[PDB]
Amino acid sequence: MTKGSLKENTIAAVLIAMTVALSILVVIPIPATKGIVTLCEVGIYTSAILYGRRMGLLVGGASGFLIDILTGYPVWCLFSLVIHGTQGLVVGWLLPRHHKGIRSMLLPLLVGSLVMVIGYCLATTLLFGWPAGLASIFGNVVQVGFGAGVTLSIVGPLTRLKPD
Amino acid sequence: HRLDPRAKLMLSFCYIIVVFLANNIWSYAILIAFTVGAILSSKISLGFFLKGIRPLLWLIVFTVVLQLLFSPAGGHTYFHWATQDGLINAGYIFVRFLLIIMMSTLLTLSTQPLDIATGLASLMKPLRWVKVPVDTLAMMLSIALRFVPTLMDEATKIMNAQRARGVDFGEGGLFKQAKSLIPLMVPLFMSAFNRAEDLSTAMEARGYQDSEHRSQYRRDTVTWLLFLLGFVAILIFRHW
Amino acid sequence: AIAFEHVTYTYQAGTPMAHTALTDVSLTVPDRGYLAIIGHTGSGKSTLIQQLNALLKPTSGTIKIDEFTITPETTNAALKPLRQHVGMVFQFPENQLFEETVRQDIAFGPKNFGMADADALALADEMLTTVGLDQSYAERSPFELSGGQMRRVAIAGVLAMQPKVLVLDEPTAGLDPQGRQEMMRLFARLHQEQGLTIVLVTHQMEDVAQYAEQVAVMHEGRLMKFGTPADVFSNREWLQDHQLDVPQAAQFARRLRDRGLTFPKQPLTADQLADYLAQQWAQR
Amino acid sequence: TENIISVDHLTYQYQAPALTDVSFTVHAGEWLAIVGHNGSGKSTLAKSLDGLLPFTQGSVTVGGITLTPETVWQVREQIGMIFQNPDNQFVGATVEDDVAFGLENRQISRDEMVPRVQAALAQVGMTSFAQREPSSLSGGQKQRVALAGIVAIAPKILILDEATSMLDPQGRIEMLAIVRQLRQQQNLTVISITHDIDEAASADRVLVIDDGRLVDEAVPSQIFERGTQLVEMGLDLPFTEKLKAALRQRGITPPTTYQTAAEMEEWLWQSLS
């Protein structure tokens, strides 16, 4: 899978740094009452749709792991590494096609998003606990909605640009 | 209170499964003895602890109260007792919340964010045998980690710049808010691309060339063997 | 227009870790002013700057800017038009670009406050041609432009809001000498022909010597010296110990002073020094 | 002697600007400085010198190893590099790792690496900054520890691709100073593609490029005689030149030949007094 490429190996690092930075920084207050920290998943999904593609799973996983360390709940680090790490890959591998059109991105985003929703739900419902799973479902559903929406909003303009 | 700190990452790795791989009442006595012992050993000063439990307090209340109310028997509208199982289970999940949250805070305050990447590089060593590149992930993770703070300084200045020219960040609802995130996200991505391209030509021209290989610039075994003994003691009783 | 009154600010509020980025700041910048803030990094210059467009509400004291009145009690909602009133240019403004075309990019500014879209695009073209050069660049993508040109596009985007007070956080940074020259002459041009109150945080002493009408010296969150460049640059040694220094014209004037001739005032600029030398040239 | 360049070309004019029929040679330990507008390649030539940016035509040979594809790293060995923007090109988790970064990947070393790193940081004087991460400092300091990092290699050639382009006057003057003392100690060739008049004045020789073609080449003192035309040439005016221009704007005619501050002062005092 990994080679790794000359420029791409650095691009992944920078994008991870960006996602983590945005994760710690940017807060998105929902209309009562939680927040949307996983706008980093915008960076994840976008990194998966841009070039992307399979390799974007690094930008998904390592970043989320670091987020778990920094935000932070270090105990969940492996879980997030797996959930996000596979999430970005589910978006990436399912994406092409040839990036043509919005729907072409709309379909794989739905599947990859469920990996987070179902993943964290099972992650919660393990140490926990019947209500924690439901709460995780709701929160991560709103969060997935925001992330996918923003990603869809950006990825258009970006594909026209983008180095490689 | 710093230590190895390479083993703390393994603590973060194992504490998750160790947490639920134990019923009772007895393994809880072992677990609490271990955790409280670690807390007392590592200073604290419960301020950051209680302030750490503070945001998740709503989730603790929600989970415990739902685990209760959906158990005495609650469903089909009837309370009283029989329920006690749900009571002690709610207590179990409450103490569970306390343990996981406080240990999360302790682990957060323990390690300095720097050496964690090198620790990851050290722990990924066996993975070398599985053909998985270790040094590439190590360099990538180190560069990313060191670029995390400087990208925060960048993300703030971009937001301030856009706010200065009319962009109203943070305001509701959600669609109009997500549309507002674009003038922040788009510049950052393109800046990240330039950040990498300049870094690629930098590393290429630098003394480090195209390598990927190969060069790298007593309390350890104690607490981990203690962790092993405690973990075995937990493995003894577990009701299954 | 601008008027600080016993202003002070601190990260982060009363709770630790406390760090007063500013303390007891009082000053007044008149209409058509041209303030130049000088000092080291982290000396409170950036805080003083962000204090203008209400990016940072003061912990104490008041900030009167024309009709506006900034106070610690002031809410975020009421400070909405203050941003269109006070334009700002952060260091390396190119980064603020994002639109697919420079026309819509420059027009994006007013569009948030107002705005009639067609009038916004037309105003975007107007600002496009008023900034440096950039004629008919409207259809071209900003990312395709050079660094300096992108800086001109961003600056035009800021100017599109029709601000009465322009703020510049080291705008000539990274630019080639011609870029810096043309940009500074652009700022002076807007200053003299349009409004225009202009705040200018820099390190280049020459631009302050030539263009600035008044100087504000910062040093760890406190406005120590304040006044005309003649008053500020009068005491050289004070600046020397503050790791600053008088302009090259003043230094060379001291060089000609030790030899030495006399001058009615300390020459801050090569033009002034040339005048003072020309008079004595006519005499002797 | 050290850097022979008979012919050079770049096909991007059909990104990095352009180059056509560029030709020059760099002497040993020579303080070279390349200047020009924006239409000039400049940074293009800087990219071509190290090894990156594969040219379509021409040939460049760093004495004595010739370019490019197979011997690129061989040429890159004896060549230090400093780029603009010190936030980038740092790559290290901290100053120490940043300095050791260049040393690391040459199959050596581990044990002898440490005292060499400490000696380099001692040489730049930032020894008390190895503990600090780049996300805390400073502008000229990150560039200075990048300079320490590349000087840890101790190459025969050093390239400054506008290192002081994005620095405060403090960090810029300081950097130029430590580069001067570095020249004093190690004695090495320093090619600096910049637009800083102080650096160009520090140079022993100045190449002026325009439209991808080397239009001029002379001693900095002779280059400064271009007066007001210096800005268009992408280089600030010496204050003596500013004063002379301001004087000829006022009837007084100063000497055409370039003069330092001391010479200008002496001539001025000689005139009226």
Side-chain angles (χ1 to χ4, degrees), chain A residues 2 4 6-7 9-18 20-22 24-26 28-29 31 34 36 39 42-43 46 50-51 58 62 65-66 69-70 72-79 126-132 135 146 150 153-154 158 161-163, chain B residues 12-13 15-16 19-20 58 62-63 66-67 70 93 96-97 100 104 107-108 113 116 120 133 136-137 140-141 143-145 147-148 151-152 155-156 159 170 173-174 177-178 181-182 184-186 188-190 192-193 195-197 200-201 203-204 210 212:
Chain A
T2 63
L6 305 183
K7 317 290 184 177
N9 191 90
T10 70
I11 301 180
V14 180
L15 289 186
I16 287 177
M18 169 185 173
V20 176
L22 287 172
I24 304 183
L25 258 181
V26 181
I28 307 299
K34 249 132 296 181
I36 302 175
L39 82 318
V42 176
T46 307
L50 279 180
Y51 316 96
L58 302 175
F65 164 81
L66 295 181
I69 310 185
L70 303 179
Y73 351 93
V75 193
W76 297 8
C77 68
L78 287 184
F79 277 79
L126 193 58
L127 302 320
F128 312 110
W130 114 281
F146 191 85
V150 177
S153 301
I154 310 161
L158 280 191
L161 304 179
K162 57 171 276 296
Chain B
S12 300
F13 292 170
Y15 194 76
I16 2 172
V19 143
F20 207 77
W58 78 268
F62 175 69
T63 300
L66 263 293
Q67 284 291 125
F70 269 89
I93 208 63
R96 187 73 78 190
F97 264 107
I100 305 179
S104 300
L107 230 303
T108 296
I116 304 182
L120 221 293
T136 67
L137 296 182
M140 176 183 301
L141 196 62
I143 289 182
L145 210 283
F147 269 91
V148 165
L151 255 131
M152 290 194 301
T156 46
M159 283 185 57
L174 281 173
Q177 187 171 184
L181 258 294
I182 309 176
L184 163 63
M185 297 297 301
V186 168
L188 267 178
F189 271 108
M190 295 306 299
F193 298 156
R195 182 60 58 91
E197 175 65 25
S200 297
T201 58
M203 294 203 313
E204 287 174 8
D210 200 80
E212 298 179 353

Side-chain angles (χ1 to χ4, degrees), chain C residues 33-52:
Chain C
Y34 202 101
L35 178 62
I37 309 180
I38 205 70
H40 304 168
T41 171
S43 59
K45 299 190 305 178
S46 299
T47 309
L48 202 159
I49 288 304
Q50 293 177 315
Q51 225 72 11
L52 290 176

Side-chain angles (χ1 to χ4, degrees), chain B residues 212-227:
Chain B
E212 298 179 353
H213 291 304
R214 206 160 291 175
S215 285
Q216 289 167 354
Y217 187 82
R218 301 180 180 181
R219 312 180 188 273
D220 180 37
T221 318
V222 177
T223 60
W224 228 93
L225 227 181
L226 195 156
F227 167 79

Side-chain angles (χ1 to χ4, degrees), chain C residues 178 180 252 259 275 284, chain D residues 37 232 236 250 261 266 273:
Chain C
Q178 173 165 321
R180 155 163 37 89
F252 194 87
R259 301 289 271 95
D275 286 324
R284 298 174 178 174
Chain D
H37 205 79
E232 178 68 32
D236 300 277
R250 292 164 180 82
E266 183 67 22
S273 301

Side-chain angles (χ1 to χ4, degrees), chain C residues 32 74 89 93-94 115 126 133 193 208 216 236 248 258 260:
Chain C
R32 291 179 168 270
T74 312
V89 176
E94 310 88 34
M115 178 64 174
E126 176 182 348
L133 292 174
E193 86 178 358
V208 177
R236 180 181 185 180
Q248 303 173 342
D258 57 56

Side-chain angles (χ1 to χ4, degrees), chain A residues 26-39 139-140 142-143, chain B residues 174:
Chain A
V26 181
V27 183
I28 307 299
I30 75 179
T33 323
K34 249 132 296 181
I36 302 175
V37 166
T38 328
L39 82 318
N140 294 20
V142 177
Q143 206 147 212
Chain B
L174 281 173

Side-chain angles (χ1 to χ4, degrees), chain D residues 72-92:
Chain D
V72 51
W73 305 114
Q74 303 180 6
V75 172
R76 197 167 298 193
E77 173 190 0
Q78 56 192 16
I79 294 183
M81 256 296 185
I82 305 184
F83 305 94
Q84 51 182 347
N85 184 22
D87 290 317
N88 307 27
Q89 80 168 334
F90 198 98
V91 326

